[PDB]
């Protein structure tokens, strides 16, 4: 049996909960694989100790979802000593870190694509719902719930949703912007604060870097009898799709957990086996990186998910 070690940065991150369950299903389907998977509890020091234990257990490959992307070098040094390949996933290491080890790879996404898709989606629905322009000024007055500062996905999604709207000729006015750390309850608290402050009556659209935060904003809006205010997210979590159906969420963007899990597993198993990382697959590895496309989701294409 081939042991593959996996660390998830935090098991109850909504998106990574989808990913980790999908990786488990891929490993279950492979009778010659034993998956050893750990919750790093959002602490890189815990993750580093977990990696020492996996290496002591003789894993033949590691799939590592970093707590801190800057720790890629620490992880590579541990793996290099045992000649163990590492497939990083979802939290992207630096190019220099990836280039420093011939058996380091990365599976994730092109972060800016999700911001562009989210902006193009907001533009489509704004055009179709001009009653959303509450002050009738032709500009979107928005609030934005940001992910973890410095996370590539949060930074790109925040920058490019606005750039895409503005590039399409839709002026935007930022009424509030703050992190809610990718968390539903923190986002509900932040949105409730904004609905209790002087810009409450001016908010026309809520933009969130992920669905967990969008769902918190949806809850705060319901509590203030403002469910007419549209909310946009990213991930297309199974639970978020239900709100797209009900109209509680105006739109989101599929972050393709099943294919990111599959590519992570396929590459780790090939490397454990001493094969080329993409051998026998159709994964496109570009300079040791696989990026899985995002897809915009709303009521019009909801049935396809
Ligand atoms: C977007 C998810 C993410 O990267 C992230 C990172 C760090 C944290 C930290 C906390 N606390 C210290 C409470 C909460 C959520 C996080 C999400
Ligand atoms: O669901 C898993 C999570 O449970 C929480 O109760 C712990 O505080 C986290 O460290 C852990 O990652
Ligand atoms: O903090 C991220 C996630 O943590 C989980 O424990 C909670 O159930 C989610 O509601 C939350 O979004
Ligand atoms: O100020 C009180 C408010 O705090 C927020 O954190 C909660 O999400 C709301 O439910 C609550 O009404
Ligand atoms: O229905 C959703 C679709 O709407 C289209 O207009 C957008 O261009 C797509 O990105 C999106 O997937
Ligand atoms: O690294 C974890 C993060 O990955 C992606 O950015 C997901 O969109 C987000 O939901 C998740 O919190
Ligand atoms: Ca307006």
Numbering used by the authors: 2 to 306
Show me the paper's own sentences about this structure:
We installed thiol-reactive derivatives of the naphthalene-based fluorophore Prodan into bacterial periplasmic glucose-binding proteins.
In the ecGBP.W183C•Acrylodan glucose complex, the ground-state carbonyl is coplanar with the naphthalene ring and emits a green color when excited, whereas in the ttGBP.F17C•Badan glucose complex it has twisted ~30° out of plane, and emits a blue color upon excitation. The fluorophore carbonyl is coplanar with the naphthalene plane in this complex which exhibits a Green emission spectrum. i The carbonyl hole is formed by K92, E149, and H152 contacts. In ecGBP.W183C•Acrylodan, the carbonyl hole is formed by K92, E149, and H152 contacts. E149 and H152 are located in the C-terminal domain, whereas K92 lies within the N-terminal domain. The H152 imidazole Nε forms a hydrogen bond with the glucose 6-hydroxyl; the Cδ atom forms a van der Waals contact with the planar carbonyl. K92 and E149 do not contact glucose, but form a salt bridge across the interdomain interface in the closed conformation; the K92 Nζ forms a hydrogen bond with the carbonyl.
